Amino acid sequence: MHLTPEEKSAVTALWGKVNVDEVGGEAYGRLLVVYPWTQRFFESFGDLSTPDAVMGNPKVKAQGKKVLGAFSDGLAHLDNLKGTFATLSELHCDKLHVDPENFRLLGNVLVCVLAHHFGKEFTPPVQAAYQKVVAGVANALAHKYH
Amino acid sequence: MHLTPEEKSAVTALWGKVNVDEVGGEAYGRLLVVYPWTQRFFESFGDLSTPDAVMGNPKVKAQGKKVLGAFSDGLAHLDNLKGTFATLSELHCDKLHVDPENFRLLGNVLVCVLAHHFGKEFTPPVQAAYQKVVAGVANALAHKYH
Amino acid sequence: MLSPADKTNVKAAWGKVGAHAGEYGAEAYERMFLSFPTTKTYFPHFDLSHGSAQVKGQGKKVADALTNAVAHVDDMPNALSALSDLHAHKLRVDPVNFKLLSHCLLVTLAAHLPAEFTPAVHASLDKFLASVSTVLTSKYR
Amino acid sequence: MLSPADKTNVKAAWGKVGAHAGEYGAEAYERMFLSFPTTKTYFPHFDLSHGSAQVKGQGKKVADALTNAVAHVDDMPNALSALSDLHAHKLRVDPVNFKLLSHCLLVTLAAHLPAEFTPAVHASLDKFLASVSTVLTSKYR
Ligand code: HEM
Ligand code: HEM
Ligand code: HEM
Ligand code: HEM
Numbered sequence: 001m002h003l004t005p006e007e008k009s010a011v012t013a014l015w016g017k018v019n020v021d022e023v024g025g026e027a028y029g030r031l032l033v034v035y036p037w038t039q040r041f042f043e044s045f046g047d048l049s050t051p052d053a054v055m056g057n058p059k060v061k062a063q064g065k066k067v068l069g070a071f072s073d074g075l076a077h078l079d080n081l082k083g084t085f086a087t088l089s090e091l092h093c094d095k096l097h098v099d100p101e102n103f104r105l106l107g108n109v110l111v112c113v114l115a116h117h118f119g120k121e122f123t124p125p126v127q128a129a130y131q132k133v134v135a136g137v138a139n140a141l142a143h144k145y146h
Numbered sequence: 147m148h149l150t151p152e153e154k155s156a157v158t159a160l161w162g163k164v165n166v167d168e169v170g171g172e173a174y175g176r177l178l179v180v181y182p183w184t185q186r187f188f189e190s191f192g193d194l195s196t197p198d199a200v201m202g203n204p205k206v207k208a209q210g211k212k213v214l215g216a217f218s219d220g221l222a223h224l225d226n227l228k229g230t231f232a233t234l235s236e237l238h239c240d241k242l243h244v245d246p247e248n249f250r251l252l253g254n255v256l257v258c259v260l261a262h263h264f265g266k267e268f269t270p271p272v273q274a275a276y277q278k279v280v281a282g283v284a285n286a287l288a289h290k291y292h
Numbered sequence: 293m294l295s296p297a298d299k300t301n302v303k304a305a306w307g308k309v310g311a312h313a314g315e316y317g318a319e320a321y322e323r324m325f326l327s328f329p330t331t332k333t334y335f336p337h338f339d340l341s342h343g344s345a346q347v348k349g350q351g352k353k354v355a356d357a358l359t360n361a362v363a364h365v366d367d368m369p370n371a372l373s374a375l376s377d378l379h380a381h382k383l384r385v386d387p388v389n390f391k392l393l394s395h396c397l398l399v400t401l402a403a404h405l406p407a408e409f410t411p412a413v414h415a416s417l418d419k420f421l422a423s424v425s426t427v428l429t430s431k432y433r
Numbered sequence: 434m435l436s437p438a439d440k441t442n443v444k445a446a447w448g449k450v451g452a453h454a455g456e457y458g459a460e461a462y463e464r465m466f467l468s469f470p471t472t473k474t475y476f477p478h479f480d481l482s483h484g485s486a487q488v489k490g491q492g493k494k495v496a497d498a499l500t501n502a503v504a505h506v507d508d509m510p511n512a513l514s515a516l517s518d519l520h521a522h523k524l525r526v527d528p529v530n531f532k533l534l535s536h537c538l539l540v541t542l543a544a545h546l547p548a549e550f551t552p553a554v555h556a557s558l559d560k561f562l563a564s565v566s567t568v569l570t571s572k573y574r
């Protein structure tokens with residue numbers, strides 16, 4: 001993984017207009033609606049019966065906020081994602097048992113949410129830069145699996 | 147690429163017994179029978195209509211030989227597969243226009259052929275070592291695509 | 293399998309695409325060529341610069357096919373029969389690439405249909421494009 | 434779509450597996466856990482060491498399901514219906530992992546059936562395991 005200076009500036013400029021908590025809850029709710037097998041980790045969260053129940057569930061919103069907050073802090077370390085997500089990688093493998101294909105699905109749902117939120121500002125080149133970033137984050141979180 | 151001492155020893159010892167030309171012709175033939183859309187690059191090779199015709203076609207066997215011969219040369223440079231295959235990477239992208247998913251398909255077919263040829267000697271741990279290596283080589287060959 | 297509710301969702305969303313289907317089809321291809329450069333290996337004969345007539349024409353033909361599938365959603369295999377033959381016997385695009393274009397069509401729709409792209413509609417569109425992709429690769433072997 | 438020749442090939446190959454089907458199911462999971470370590474996330478409650486009786490048990494169950502599928506090759510969705518319900522609504526294995534066990538299945542048959550794993554039989558078996566996987570994931574959404 002490698003970004004040009006141009007790609008980096010495009011990622012950072014758009015991320016400055018993101019409400020991390022709102023975007024986090026909308027991407028993580030849409031992950032659970034669109035790919036419902038990812039609900040397997042969240043039986044303790046209550047009502048996930050319909051799309052409206054998922055999107056309105058406060059435990060789903062809390063999880064999204066935690067996950068995007070970590071993603072966000074990762075954007076300050078684009079030159080060292082493997083070193084930044086090393087400990088979280090170990091935790092997702094050894095303790096949480098999350099298949100890393102889930103990270104890839106979240107990445108594509110997040111790109112769809114940014115396009116929905118920014119409309120025409122989310123141009124083809126800006127999408128291409130974010131596609132590299134989410135693949136890089138997913139690769140960094142899968143790195144310590146064994 | 148990083149391989150344990152155990153994985154590297156498993157790879158090298160088995161490869162000392164491979165007849166590169168025979169295994170090459172068998173693996174490339176099976177690739178064209180099992181995933182027939184891969185025949186799109188080989189319209190000048192002759193009759194590819196039935197399994198027998200593909201397996202007995204001399205141009206398929208020569209192509210198999212070629213490809214496994216270069217694969218074999220890569221096994222001598224396991225610490226730097228990207229630098230070793232940089233020139234062929236650019237050739238496959240810019241001149242031959244081959245989608246790199248084809249490299250992953252050949253890798254799995256090659257694993258099946260090694261199991262067919264060696265039997266019980268191709269144990270679970272030996273297969274695992276080879277899975278890492280074919281994945282490494284496909285990634286090295288896709289590296290210079292743009 | 294598409295449920296009755298999915299069918300309703302797709303028909304509503306594609307109806308709001310309306311006359312822009314061909315422009316959106318072209319934008320989805322441009323998005324895929326930039327984000328996933330290995331897909332450019334199937335178009336070495338194309339001028340791939342932004343706004344080329346070849347890319348605009350490909351966009352329009354792919355939109356027309358999707359419009360035919362929405363109108364015949366209960367009989368897709370028969371409606372897309374000629375295209376499933378062409379992709380299996382002549383173009384022979386590896387099946388992984390259908391998932392990359394479907395993703396780029398979903399991004400394109402999200403960016404142009406802010407009111408209509410709800411969670412439930414996103415889910416129905418994703419399923420519909422997976423079903424179209426399944427029909428177009430059904431005769432590969 | 435499985436042709437008459439594919440069905441004949443699959444029934445002849447699975448017939449030779451015979452009473453070894455459970456042994457071979459177990460070896461396929463063992464091959465899969467070592468080759469693709471991410472699939473171990475679905476069995477945190479298992480002892481995954483070589484020889485494990487829990488892996489042997491899982492191998493036998495899967496192999497019996499496949500025998501049932503071979504016997505009902507023209508009626509697979511109904512014969513595997515409980516099993517498609519279980520994977521979609523309780524186990525929720527991501528669909529990508531069925532490709533990985535199918536490859537490991539094929540490697541195991543090659544390693545144990547040299548005379549029978551011809552190019553044509555290998556192509557029919559891969560088509561059959563993709564059909565089984567398609568039925569098992571058909572109710573996920
Ligand atoms: C960008 C990708 C992701 C990032 C950065 C991320 C990050 C995190 C963080 C920071 C935590 C809290 C760790 C702690 O307790 O110290 C966490 C917990 C967790 N994550 Fe991930 N996550 C990601 C994707 C996912 C996905 C896709 C899933 C499953 C679909 C998942 C499942 C979980 C679960 C089950 C927990 C524990 C929740 C709890 O105990 O309340 N994560 N993640
Ligand atoms: C292990 C992976 C591979 C290696 C190491 C490899 C290597 C090679 C080599 C050494 C050549 C000869 C080039 C020359 O003229 O100097 C070649 C040619 C070629 N390769 Fe690859 N190859 C691999 C996989 C594939 C696959 C999977 C395909 C497509 C299914 C493919 C498509 C081609 C084509 C179309 C040619 C040109 C053949 C001709 O001259 O008619 N290669 N490759
Ligand atoms: C939603 C999935 C798709 C649909 C509905 C679709 C539909 C079509 C249609 C209607 C045509 C034109 C046939 C004609 O000229 O009459 C076509 C051609 C073509 N498609 Fe597919 N397509 C799809 C996916 C793909 C993908 C993923 C690729 C490659 C990445 C692709 C590559 C091509 C190519 C190379 C041609 C021939 C273009 C030319 O030379 O004019 N298609 N497609
Ligand atoms: C050919 C494809 C497969 C078939 C035919 C199949 C069939 C079965 C069967 C018959 C059972 C036992 C159900 C019972 O208790 O009645 C089962 C359980 C299970 N399968 Fe699948 N399966 C397949 C693929 C997979 C894959 C790829 C995975 C994950 C990588 C998987 C994960 C599981 C798990 C975790 C269980 C529950 C095991 C336990 O805790 O006892 N299966 N499967």
